[PDB]
């Protein structure tokens, strides 16, 4: 049966009819003996009925290729840490066993991401970029960006490495385009028309870690930025149409590291050292109009950046404010801890970027020839210079935080008397802890943590476990009054962490004025003992900024920098998983496999319908 | 060209071409038309290197594996140390593309190797062990081996 014998026994029998093929091909369609042998066999499955595997060799050898295609495979290579050989001993493994090979070689991947990360699609900017080179493919940088490394000055210790921010951000928005054409056409927009006047907002965060267990400090460093929403403007009288706007902006799977450095956050030297040319593209970028090859058309798009995911201490460290028990406690207004534990609400936003270069202009040079003091008082807390410019807003996730720390340090304060006896010791603050505690495992089941960290300020801050630290608190006022508390706290705190208030939560947008109102009198009535003149500064942003900020920017909690946060678990996980290993190679490939982990394009691969 | 037209001008363009192949057929092989055809496919396509196209096409016809052993798949889990739910991710996004499913869920896995694990097969002795119980279905046991836990005595 020809079906037994080798190949080279088939050449030798059906020689004369490949000939045959192949002269009848010539003179008829071409040459093409392959195609003409295709639709042939083709055709005699099509004879039988035998349509199901005429269809699948109709499928097979056009559009799809093999088994599965190479980009789902890239995707999970990436989406599960699987080292290279790992996974070349399971592509062996499925490939020889019944195959028909599935997977992809290492090769293929390797030589199909170049798609996914940045320095790959052109693009210009119009009108120029302001002292950036315009050559289009530049990949992974390192980020001491030509430092003269001689001994003698100082040294160019610190390793880094980094995208050109522009490149990040062409890709990650050519990885938008599926998107932003889905949005134009979804709106039944025009698309070739109306390509000038697209309008991007972009969250950008930054964070260190310390305890990195290493394999210079232990602490590092990674800068990322985020794509919030993009809305459109052409053609006039309008404003900007939205198209996009981000459905889980809290997520990690939707935040785009750009550096990683092995630096702590406290020294600025090295930081400013380091994060400089981002100032400066950012600064330089917000001018120009970006020109991009989207939805077969090349098109402009303009910017707008908002710094919203840095935290407290590195918001006030970066913008030359003094921290951060200092007098001025707000970043937002100007009012000392005594004048804000006097007036809760009535302020007013007045903290930017430029106004605090002036203020600290009038510290410099002194105009007035003022003593230390009083300098302090004209500017109002501005010492050192900005570096940055970050939105002046509040961070969400935080503030749970410290709200959570405060109610724990309340109730262990409760159990015992503070009101009765003003000055207690150590002891019974720890001996309070302690039935606090026996308290809380017996009753809601939650074991203490030496640091409260958000998903159990999220048990915390809730009726039962409070109710369940109630019934310690023998006076019946006392007991009532903090519930009603935890009750008022818990009515105004879905308008902040939510991600559109206008629209999911309306209603404590309108008695949020009110809500807060009985909140801070109930608190400085029965509480004047410990709130007389020393208040956090969260509490602060929560009881005179909240309804003028998402007034101002229509939406809060979404900014917060939780997604950053969460995904240094993965940052972690990569530094053990794909280590390179060495210092040098190390941060550039996290780098990379974390651009990877974070695409879209890969990550509607790894959803595959649900 | 014969690749993007409708199925009868491909058919009356190449009638000749399969009534020669079909006469050689008859002549040869008893008159195994789909054979024939198809092994010309194998030497066509295999002229230009491009084996990968050979190997799908013997993939199709009397396939070994749409799907593996699931013997074949714990081993390939507990080779690659992949974690159960980065697994169980995996198989939900390869299923879900192209995937009539191959992998098989892990929880045909757990009572898969209940042949692999100790304690499955009937055994004995003769004599009888000493000193040793003769049930033979015991699994994994804690090695403590009856420590009497009471706190004063050695812990
Ligand atoms: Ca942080
Ligand atoms: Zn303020």
Known sequence: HLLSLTRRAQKHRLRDLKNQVKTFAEKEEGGDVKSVCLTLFLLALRAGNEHKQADELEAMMQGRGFGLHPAVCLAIRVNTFLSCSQYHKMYRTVKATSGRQIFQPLHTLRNAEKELLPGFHQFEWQPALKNVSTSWDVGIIDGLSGWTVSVDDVPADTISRRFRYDVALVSALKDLEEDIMEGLRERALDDSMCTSGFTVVVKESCDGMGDVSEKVPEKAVRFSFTIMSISIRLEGEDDGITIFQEQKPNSELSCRPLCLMFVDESDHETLTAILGPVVAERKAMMESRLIISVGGLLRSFRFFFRGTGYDEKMVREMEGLEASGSTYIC????????????????????????????????????????????????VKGVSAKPFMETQPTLDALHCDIGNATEFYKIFQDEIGEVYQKPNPSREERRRWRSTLDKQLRKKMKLKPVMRMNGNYARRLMTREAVEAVCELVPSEERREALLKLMDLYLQMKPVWRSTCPSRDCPDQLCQYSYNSQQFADLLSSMFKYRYDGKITNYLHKTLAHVPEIVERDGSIGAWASEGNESGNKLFRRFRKMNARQSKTFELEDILKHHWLYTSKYLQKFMEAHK
């Open 331 to 378: 970043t937002l207004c100007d009012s000392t801890r005594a004048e804000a534990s006097q007036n809760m609400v009535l302020h007013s936003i007045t903290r930017s970027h430029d106004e605090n270069l002036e203020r600290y202009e009038i510290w410099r040079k002194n105009p007035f020839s003022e003593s230390a003091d009083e300098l302090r008082d004209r």
